[PDB]
Design a protein around this ligand. Sequence first.
Ligand SMILES: [K+]
Ligand SMILES: [Mg+2]
Ligand SMILES: [Mg+2]
Ligand SMILES: [Mg+2]
Ligand SMILES: [Mg+2]
Ligand SMILES: [Mg+2]
Ligand SMILES: [Mg+2]
Ligand SMILES: [Mg+2]
Ligand SMILES: [Mg+2]
Lengths: 88, 80, 199, 134
Amino acid sequence: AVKIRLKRIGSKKKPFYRIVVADSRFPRDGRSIETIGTYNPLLDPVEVKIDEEATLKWMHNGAKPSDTVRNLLSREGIMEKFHNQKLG
Amino acid sequence: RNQRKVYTGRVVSDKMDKTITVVVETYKKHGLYGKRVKYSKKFKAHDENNIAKTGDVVRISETRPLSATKHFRLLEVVEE
Amino acid sequence: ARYTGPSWKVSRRLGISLSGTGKELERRPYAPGQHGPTQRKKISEYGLQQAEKQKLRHMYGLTERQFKNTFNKAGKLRGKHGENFMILLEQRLDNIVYRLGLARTRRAARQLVNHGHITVDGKRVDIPSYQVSVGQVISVREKSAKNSAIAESLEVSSFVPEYVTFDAEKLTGSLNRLPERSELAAEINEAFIVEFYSR
Amino acid sequence: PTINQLVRKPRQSKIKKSTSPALNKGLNSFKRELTDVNSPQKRGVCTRVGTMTPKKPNSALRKYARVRLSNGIEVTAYIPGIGHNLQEHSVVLIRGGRVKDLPGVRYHIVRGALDTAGVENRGQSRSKYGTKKP
RNA sequence: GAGAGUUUGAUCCUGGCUCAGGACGAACGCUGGCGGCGUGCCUAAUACAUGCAAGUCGAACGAACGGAUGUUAGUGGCGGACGGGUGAGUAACACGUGGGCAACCUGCCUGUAAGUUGGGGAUAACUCCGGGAAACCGGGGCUAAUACCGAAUGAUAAAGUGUGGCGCAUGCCACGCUUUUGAAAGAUGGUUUCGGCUAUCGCUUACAGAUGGGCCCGCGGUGCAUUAGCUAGUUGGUAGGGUAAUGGCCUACCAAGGCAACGAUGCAUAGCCGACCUGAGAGGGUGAUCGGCCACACUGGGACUGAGACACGGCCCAGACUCCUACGGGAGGCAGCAGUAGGGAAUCUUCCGCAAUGGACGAAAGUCUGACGGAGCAACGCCGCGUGUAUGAAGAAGGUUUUCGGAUCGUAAAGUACUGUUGUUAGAGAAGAACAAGGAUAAGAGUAACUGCUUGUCCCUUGACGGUAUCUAACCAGAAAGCCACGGCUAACUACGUGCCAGCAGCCGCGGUAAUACGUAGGUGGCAAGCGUUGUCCGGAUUUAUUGGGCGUAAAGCGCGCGCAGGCGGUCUUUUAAGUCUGAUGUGAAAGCCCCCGGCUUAACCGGGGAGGGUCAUUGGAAACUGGAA
Ligand SMILES: [K+]
Ligand SMILES: [Mg+2]
Ligand SMILES: [Mg+2]
Ligand SMILES: [Mg+2]
Ligand SMILES: [Mg+2]
Ligand SMILES: [Mg+2]
Ligand SMILES: [Mg+2]
Ligand SMILES: [Mg+2]
Ligand SMILES: [Mg+2]
């Protein structure tokens, strides 16, 4: 499959995550197709940056998210957005 | 459309059947000591009718493979 | 501290008062050891430049690896290399402690900030190697305020520089503005150092 | 030279020789063929032990051992320091270093690594000659 | 863009040798306190003791177990081709960069348009029989399906075609008619009236896309000519078959070409790159860790299965090697994670957990994952912190030395005051956690409507690390410093002992009875939880000189000519645009170097953003110079 998921980066006991487009097959920190955001769970508000237009695009092409990437999208208001574009 | 590669050169032989060999001859810069070197490189051109001859200036263009060696085609005969 | 040895012989070896003001040197300025009063020798280019380095890094009391990393880091800054290095070397926290004068010398300042008897920006910092910059306060932990070493070491203050402020009612001070090689003490050349590291 | 000369043949630098050729060769019993591998130290078995008369200007006797290394090369190794433990069929560890007094020696014996027992009675430079601290 | 020492009686040049810096996957010697981040078989792609690394679905199927849920050994589906390992081979479209495919494929993912109609025959499991210790094998009989095989209706699949618009020759795109083929399946759930209808998970056909692959091509990157010829399906063509697809890919027939001093062929070497180290830069060396691509899974070959393999933990066969046996016959491939032996100067625990991130299966709960998170060991490296702080004298005892007066170790100690980074003791105790599923509900599209689906908001929920970091108090200077050198090069000198002996040494060189060069003590210098030696790489080395050298005498002009090839080429006009120069577009991944911000008590480290980098390619311009032409 083609998936939207998390790329683990940073250091030990202090993770950071890039939000990435990739195949199911490729490795966790291997290659990708395009990276479109970042994530950090450490902070009291988790800090998310997403482009959202490429993200809508990859979803329209059928790149599905993970669970946590889905809920990041929904708490950013992007899954409502994508449903709204599926309405027509 | 997307476009293909085209080159110009000179003919060296005619013994082959419905084809020729076009030698391209370009100056280019020696990697370290900076001088210009005569780089040459011959290709096999697909001659649909055995038109061209030896001593002929010619233009070719690439295409699907047509033999073990050919990948090009005669496009024009610029100057005999 | 990092250097746990005696103090006076270094100043003697270097021909400059470091870790004091004539304390070590005004009696027998000559070099320590079997030799120094009996004879002296003429000292070479290498030795002079080296001795300049020594006068910096034993004035501040830090390892040579750390010292050279500080050199190379200061090398980035736009300006005169050794001036930038001297002012950053002053911009270390130990300096600011000793200039505020809650302790009588660099090594005591290091011990203070090692046990974390001070707090930058309100927060704790237990390292002598912190870098202060313009506007950062510093305090005495609100808990190490009455202790006799500080209470007796604040009785002395040779002169407060013009790039620091201090309120002893609070025991709170701060760096004002970065010096430029005239606010400081100026018993050094800042060029033989860069020679010695450039060869 | 002319540039055309330099194109017809580019330059060719010098072929560097090593101070320590025999450290820079490994062996595998299988292939029975030496394999170039940069190595700092090698262990060996003392074939012979003896003394040497060195060059002019000097005259003191110099202790050496003819060793067969792990890789099969036979090598003369100086035995630095006062007195030693070594004799025939003694195992020894070997570092590089050239005895300028002595013609056929190019390497030293690390003292204190193996059956080369440390020097007696030494107090200074102990890390060399391999005496513990007392 | 730093130089220093060393040839001589001395000098200048030439020329070599060494040194001062930086870096290591390092080893070794002496010593050794801690924390954070990292790194750790480079050698025998040598051999493997053992354990675990690929399973899953009961909402596909039948049987058995069971007091309706649940479980299973089997048939079936998907995945096993990912992830993980190593660098053997490989000098080539293998890799990088940039294009091309009108000459090509693509399960799972998304969307669009249609359709899941009716039947058949078996086969495991099971039960028996015989064999065999037993597994496990056969032979008979019974049996279910989302397993298999038929049909009707449906091809933007073929064949016959005709029209429109076109490209780059082979040709492409769109439309329509005729003829000939090609499909399927159910499961769960609700509702309804019982026929029906119907959500989701699946199935079949076509189309698009995305993603993943495949073929071709330009150029680029290694030494040897003490290796000059090589090739014979080899080169082209006409027919034919073959692949997902072009093509001597293969076959038959015809011709005899083709490549190559612009280094072919052959030998040895090597995975390639991003990038790493060094350097003023050009360049030199490397291809550990991280990412990409390639290749290979004891060696060799071959296929089947499948969307995808000629398959690490599949098959067959040959070969080597090994293991168990009841001696009849069976089984196997650690370059998966640990680990063992061996080799070696040398490199880790036979650890915990799927909490996280990601993958396989599943409707999902969940299961699986030596991927991955973590923890362990090694001072292997980078950073950080200590091993006390202050005060305290003409200056204790002692050591060294004494020019026997003193000088020095030395404010060091003692003594006094103070602190608790660390250590210890007792207490507290975060992040990381998002969710998923389930329970509620609010809106949608779609429904006869329900179920369901999608989305919004709440509730609930689960931590290996780990009672780890972190934080509070109490107690104690208490338990926490060693290595190298001291003639010059190069920082730092005395005493004794020895007597060309013992011994030192990177170069020069020391030691033959007054040794700052050996050994020791004191003192000093440089570093410091590391220091030094060895090995390797760059520089310095303009010592391979493109930048950037030279040949009268120092090394260096063939003994001289005739001359093929090549290199280089007088003055002017026109023409071009091969080279050159130039504007635009596209790309040169992330990480790394560089710059700017932020976060870890700073640092190391980590994040964000930008920049750079190509003899890069296409397209469009100039004609001064080189080149081509008249
Ligand atoms: K062929
Ligand atoms: Mg190899
Ligand atoms: Mg250079
Ligand atoms: Mg397999
Ligand atoms: Mg295996
Ligand atoms: Mg292993
Ligand atoms: Mg003597
Ligand atoms: Mg001569
Ligand atoms: Mg990049």
